[PDB]
Amino acid sequence: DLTATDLARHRWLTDNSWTRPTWTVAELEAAKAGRTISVVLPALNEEETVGGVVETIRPLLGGLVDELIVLDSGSTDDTEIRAMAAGARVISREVALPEVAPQPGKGEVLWRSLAATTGDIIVFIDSDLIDPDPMFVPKLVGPLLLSEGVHLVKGFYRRPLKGGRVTELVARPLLAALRPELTCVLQPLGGEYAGTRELLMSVPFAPGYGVEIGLLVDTYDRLGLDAIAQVNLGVRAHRNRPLTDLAAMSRQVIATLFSRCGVPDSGVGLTQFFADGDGFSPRTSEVSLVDRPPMNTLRG
Amino acid sequence: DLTATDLARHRWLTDNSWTRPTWTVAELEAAKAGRTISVVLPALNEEETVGGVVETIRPLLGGLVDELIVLDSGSTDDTEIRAMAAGARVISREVALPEVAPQPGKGEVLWRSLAATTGDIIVFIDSDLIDPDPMFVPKLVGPLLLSEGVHLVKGFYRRPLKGGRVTELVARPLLAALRPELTCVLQPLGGEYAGTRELLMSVPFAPGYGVEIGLLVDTYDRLGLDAIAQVNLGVRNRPLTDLAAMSRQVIATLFSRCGVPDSGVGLTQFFADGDGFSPRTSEVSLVDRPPMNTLRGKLAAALE
Ligand SMILES: O=Cc1ccc(O)cc1
Ligand SMILES: O=Cc1ccc(O)cc1
Ligand SMILES: O=Cc1ccc(O)cc1
Ligand SMILES: O=Cc1ccc(O)cc1
Ligand SMILES: O=Cc1ccc(O)cc1
Ligand SMILES: O=Cc1ccc(O)cc1
Ligand SMILES: O=Cc1ccc(O)cc1
């Protein structure tokens, strides 16, 4: 009947998951107790949405939130200037961490943001969200401010009563196989999450689209379920990404899970083919992004 | 840009992949050279489609095809009667291997069929296909009969000019990580494939929905990429929950073949009523059936 995974997951849901994370901004400010909060929006060519995300967070500046930074990854559209006008601080990868040459991918941006921020709590929110809700940051920081022993909070979106394909086909099944207690986390790949500086400075950062799952597993391997919480951010329909983006995402999720769980990885990516009447000429990507070491090895 | 594995991928697609098989039934019959062909359709509650599949293969019986069997896995609908009416012999799991109690899942059915068939070549075709093409069996056996050194033929379906979600997000990326040459196989999880008796009797069979990936990986390791071919068969909507459970078993079987320590924990959904909570957990098995030549050694030796 019941397994040890079932028992732990059920109890974790009752203690470390909030379906209605309704703490008030005032009570969260009162609980800061000298701690400061930084909010980071990673961004690459998100000109249509970045300002709207910033606008939903900026009312918290000077109270709950101490800094609001857009960490730009080399946009060629109007991402940076729209973020400026909307009321954020825009910092490039190069200014965030001058002593290390950048490499591509989302994980690099989040890692570098640790060097550019000062908060005791760092909140990450994706910059591609349409009409996000102003209560995202309060909900994400609640367990960090109020619940002893929590270092990582994952924000999830409620599923309607009536596409998450990488989460449900790749990430959750692989966690079931390799780290089954972590199947408790509803949206392990979600981009809205918060952590303590103590935690985040102490773990390596996986590259590209592996960053979220890498942080989740590294936290678990150091502190177990007790240190991880999740909060319901409300409704939000699934994003529709191209299938080729998704297969590449899956491949990086696999690589990052394997690196943390002791499984070797070939470094071989997926193959694209030149196709014509003479057949299919393969071109296969190979690994070129490295994990970044804990930021404590360079700062603080 | 080109990388190290691309040479092997290019050679294999040139020699072992057929986008447009030219073969006629007549040429294939003339090439059998004393080999016999068994066709096996695994089935569990497929009354709406099984007859249609059988009807497309039945005209080959007595010529290209020597035996046509539906291996029924305990259906309670009209699968059995509809398969017989279309011209298949229907064999239960118990009849196929009477002294061994059945275990659930698709892999069990295919494994058991090895004890109930006599072919030097065995062709598997899913019984849930809609409007299958009568050239499926000819296309699948072509490389076995007309090429040298091929032991496993995987049928693939035509890709569009732009749901295979498990293949493209799970199987192919995992193979890239753990058996990188095998990403060249377009349909690693496909249910339409043919193998030699020599191969099939000698390998363990993975349980459940792991059977196809397990056979592919075992064939690759033991016989190599050149022993695997693929053929275009020409042109389904399952709930995400079912695809996730299938993915979880594909993972378990690949991990078993690599020695990765899979927990055996399935995918769990909690349900609640007035009395409380209880989990519903998807089926996962890490236990292979042993090579059929260990239980049917005399049959295997007769066929060798
Ligand atoms: O509060 C929601 C909840 C859901 C499933 C559980 O097992 C426990 C709690
Ligand atoms: O009775 C159901 C229940 C769900 C979640 C909780 O946290 C507590 C109770
Ligand atoms: O903020 C999202 C992001 C995505 C891809 C990148 O390379 C960098 C940032
Ligand atoms: O401190 C709790 C803890 C739990 C599980 C681990 O593996 C390590 C630490
Ligand atoms: O496709 C055939 C099949 C047989 C037994 C199963 O359990 C599942 C599928
Ligand atoms: O035969 C090779 C091939 C590769 C990719 C496709 O999408 C189709 C065919
Ligand atoms: O995909 C999730 C799942 C959970 C329980 C099951 O029984 C089957 C599937």
From TrEMBL, chain A:
Its cofactor is Mn(2+); Mg(2+). Mg(2+) 2 binds at residue 128. It comes from the Bacteria. SUPFAM superfamilies: Nucleotide-diphospho-sugar transferases (SSF53448). It catalyses: an NDP-alpha-D-glucose + (2R)-3-phosphoglycerate = (2R)-2-O-(alpha-D-glucopyranosyl)-3-phospho-glycerate + a ribonucleoside 5'-diphosphate + H(+); (2R)-3-phosphoglycerate + UDP-alpha-D-glucose = (2R)-2-O-(alpha-D-glucopyranosyl)-3-phospho-glycerate + UDP + H(+). UDP-alpha-D-glucose binds at residues 44, 46, 73, 105-106, 126-127, 209, 212, 241. InterPro entries: Glyco_trans_2-like (IPR001173), Glycosyltransferase_2 (IPR050256), Nucleotide-diphossugar_trans (IPR029044). GO terms for molecular function: glycosyltransferase activity; metal ion binding; nucleotide binding. Keywords: Glycosyltransferase, Magnesium, Metal-binding, Nucleotide-binding, Transferase. UDP binds at residues 44, 46, 73, 105, 127, 209, 241. Its EC number is 2.4.1.266. (R)-malate 2 binds at residues 164, 166-167, 241. (S)-malate binds at residues 164, 166-167, 239. Mg(2+) 1 binds at residue 46. (R)-malate 1 binds at residues 166-167, 241. Belongs to the glycosyltransferase 2 family. This is Glucosyl-3-phosphoglycerate synthase.
UniProtKB/TrEMBL annotation, chain B:
The lineage of its organism: Bacteria, Bacillati, Actinomycetota, Actinomycetes, Mycobacteriales. Belongs to the glycosyltransferase 2 family. It catalyses: an NDP-alpha-D-glucose + (2R)-3-phosphoglycerate = (2R)-2-O-(alpha-D-glucopyranosyl)-3-phospho-glycerate + a ribonucleoside 5'-diphosphate + H(+); (2R)-3-phosphoglycerate + UDP-alpha-D-glucose = (2R)-2-O-(alpha-D-glucopyranosyl)-3-phospho-glycerate + UDP + H(+). Its cofactor is Mn(2+); Mg(2+). UDP binds at residues 44, 46, 73, 105, 127, 209, 238. UDP-alpha-D-glucose binds at residues 44, 46, 73, 105-106, 126-127, 209, 212, 238. NCBIfam families: PRK13915.1. Keywords: Glycosyltransferase, Magnesium, Metal-binding, Nucleotide-binding, Transferase. It comes from the Bacteria. InterPro entries: Glyco_trans_2-like (IPR001173), Glycosyltransferase_2 (IPR050256), Nucleotide-diphossugar_trans (IPR029044). Gene3D superfamilies: Spore Coat Polysaccharide Biosynthesis Protein SpsA, Chain A. This is Glucosyl-3-phosphoglycerate synthase. Its EC number is 2.4.1.266. (R)-malate 1 binds at residues 166-167, 238.
